[PDB]
From a paper:
Leucine-rich repeat kinase 2 (LRRK2) is a highly pursued drug target for Parkinson’s disease (PD), which is the second most common neurodegenerative disease projected to affect 17.5 million people by 20401. LRRK2 is a 286-kDa protein containing seven domains (ARM, ANK, LRR, ROC, COR, KIN, and WD40) with kinase and GTPase activities. Here we report high-resolution cryo-EM structures of LRRK2 in complex with a panel of small molecules, including two type I (LRRK2-IN-1 and GNE-7915) and three type II inhibitors (rebastinib, ponatinib, and GZD-824).
Following a similar purification approach, type II inhibitors were mixed with full-length LRRK2 protein in an ATP-free buffer before cryo-EM analysis. GZD-824 and ponatinib are analogous compounds and bind to LRRK2 in a similar manner. Specifically, the main chains of A1950 and D2017 and the side chain of E1920 form polar interactions with nitrogen and oxygen atoms in all three small molecules. Our structures show that Ala2016 directly interacts with all three type II inhibitors tested here, with its side chain pointing towards the inhibitors, but not ATP. Furthermore, rebastinib, ponatinib, and GZD-824 occupy the position that was otherwise taken by the alpha helix of the activation segment. Tyr2018 in the “DYG” motif rotates and interacts with type II inhibitors, and Lys1906 and Glu1920 form a salt bridge. Additionally, the αC helix moves towards the ATP-binding site and interacts with the small molecules.
Author numbering:
A (entry chain B): 1597 to 1613, 1642 to 1659, 1668 to 1720, 1726 to 1799, 1804 to 1862
B (entry chain A): 1331 to 1358, 1366 to 1457, 1463 to 1613, 1642 to 1659, 1668 to 1720, 1726 to 1799, 1804 to 1995
Write the structure that this text describes.
Amino acid sequence: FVEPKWLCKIMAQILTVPKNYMTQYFKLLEKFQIALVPSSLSDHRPVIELPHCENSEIIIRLYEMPYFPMGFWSRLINRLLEISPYMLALRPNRMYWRQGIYLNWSPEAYCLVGSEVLDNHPESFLKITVPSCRKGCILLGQVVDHIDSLMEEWFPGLLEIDGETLLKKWALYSFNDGEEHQKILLDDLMKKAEEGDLLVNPDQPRLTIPISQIAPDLILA
Amino acid sequence: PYNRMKLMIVGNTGSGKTTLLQQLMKTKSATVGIDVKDWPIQIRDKRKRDLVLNVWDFAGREEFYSTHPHFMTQRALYLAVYDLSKGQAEVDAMKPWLFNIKARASSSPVILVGTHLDVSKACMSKITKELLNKRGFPAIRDYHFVNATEESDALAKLRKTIINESLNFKIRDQLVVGQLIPDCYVELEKIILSERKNVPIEFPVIDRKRLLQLVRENQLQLDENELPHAVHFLNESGVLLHFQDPALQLSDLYFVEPKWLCKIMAQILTVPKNYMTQYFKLLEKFQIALVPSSLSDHRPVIELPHCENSEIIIRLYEMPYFPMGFWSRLINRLLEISPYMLALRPNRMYWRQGIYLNWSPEAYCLVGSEVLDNHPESFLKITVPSCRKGCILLGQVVDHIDSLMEEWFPGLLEIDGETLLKKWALYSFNDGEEHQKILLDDLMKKAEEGDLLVNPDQPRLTIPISQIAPDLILADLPRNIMLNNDELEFEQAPEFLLGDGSFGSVYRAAYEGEEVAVKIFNKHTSLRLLRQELVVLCHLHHPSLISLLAAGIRPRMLVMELASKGSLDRLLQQDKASLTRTLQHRIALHVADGLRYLHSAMIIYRDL
Ligand SMILES: Nc1nc2c(ncn2[C@@H]2O[C@H](COP(=O)(O)OP(=O)(O)O)[C@@H](O)[C@H]2O)c(=O)[nH]1
């Protein structure tokens, strides 16, 4: 491509609205994350009455960054596009929107990567709701790998220590048997540093939760 | 004679409604709720029939709409105002109001009224004389182009026309404004209007015990059994609102001054701790509760797993416009009330125009609006997988939708006659690989029950009627139950083979080498009651219950096991000697076992 201003103008043309290379046209259009158009996707989360509630049967993993990166979500969505199957075949139900994906195989084999805002917090989050089953843990592993890959490959500035790192990965757990609420949050690096045992315990040692049901990518589950 | 008829001012936002009302009554800010009033009319003719029209100035704003169909009754005269200032367009913009009147109160007269004559476009009279006359619409009986905010001869003629059309209501020659009622009814009416004053303005509700003390204190001779029918008639007349159904706890609370109730319920849309539980219950009874309205109106992109045409089932539903408050009722009706199995919670993605439950990649369901190009109508596409569990979901959903239509909006089923509601089915004789799914009306396919297949002009290709409409052919139930008519030995005509006297229409026939009892459910009715009894009897499987063998469509019949010795009634009458102590106890034990299993399934065998 010579005179790149022409290329970039022509590629940005179709956003506000040579038949030989039309296939290459669409290929590079996908290489620009334009193709279905990921942008202009109504910006509105649809209400999702998930089957499983409680705290015991699910796994959360927040991702705290001040603002979402410039072109993050399109890259992520286009990366998770059928590239994370629970098994090693079947097409999963998908509900795309500009801030989430929510694949769905079965009532116990789903996955939902979607933005979420918390009150009194000007930061941004990337809540990842995943069932506690085995296939759940598999999906969680694949998704965390793909996201960390995008971060290390596209936006390096959000990983290098200065130093709050500008990107803090949390994990959500409930020592209150799941029936109660207000899931306590634990930074990921600390739990990684708690590999000495295979359990986590609060000040009151009577209650104890395995590190497999909070982070099955750290413990090899 | 009872001189009281409901007047209802429907209309579109921004028009003249509350001011038009305030000028008809001469009782010299947006509307929230419905603003119930009542103005009396002293007839100046010799027959001075003093009547009271209670007006219901419906608010035009779109967010309230899902509560509007609840207060549209048959015994009512509807005004409809359409703001002539924005001429030639608002007349078309008030078509949904007319269609919803026709959907709810089919045979109620309507009086078009054109406000804003002060400014400007009177050629809207042309379109309202050609387009809005008789195109599946609720029989417009007059036009009026009147100013508001200023009494005039146009206002005078308009008001006189309201009164004239009021008296000449006569549904099937009834003369509603002058029908006869028992004295106790009008007595109860008077004591309610007096009790309107002596009640907390902040909480105008009254108690059934307080009502009982009221009717005891006065000369009302109404009995306890005579109360429900009485207060129900008062409800129809728009005096006090009540809901005697036991599903709600409101059968002890009688709402007086209904304008307060409706305003308070519509309050929370634009944004007494003892009855907060009943508050939420009736809030659900108003389809407010999660709030079904204000749900972003935007379909989310759904990349369904299965494409093609062979592995899926579509079923369009064509109506000109969606009814007034349809979608809220439907969503709230399908709320977890259609499980694939007889346990598991399905994934759901609610939005104002769809539900899309989801169990498994082959066990989903999606009921959602869809527009087609070059088609100003509306559609209710229902995508369902071709698997067995799919067909089960399809059956339940069609039943629930048809139930809503027959129970809420009767005007969309009665033939005139295009029926204003045409159910399609989508099929592809091109092996599914190709496209442009041909559409076939449902009534036509129902008439094609003679065979079990459908075939085009080219007879080489042929598609079963089970994979296009598994509710017509009895495949939506589990455990396919067709009777394999080759092996049946039934003769319907003779009274020689009746089961016995007074068993309905149960005949005695031989099937699969065994004598069986078959009920001919065939009549003018549809497959509704047949399938209803079929899903009940589909999964019981108990010894003390009559076991089902097969069901049929040509003609509609139910094939069940045959009781050789006849009913117990005959043995009690004819042969009292056959019954001994041990036999009587065994009969009692078996019936008790049957009732136990039934109540374990939470089923009420009402009569025994
Ligand atoms: N000049 C003029 N104004 C009108 C006429 N009819 C209604 N309006 C205006 O419309 C307003 C009333 O709107 P309203 O019916 O209450 O709206 P709604 O409550 O949503 O039905 C008043 O403020 C009037 O000024 C009319 O014939 N002429």
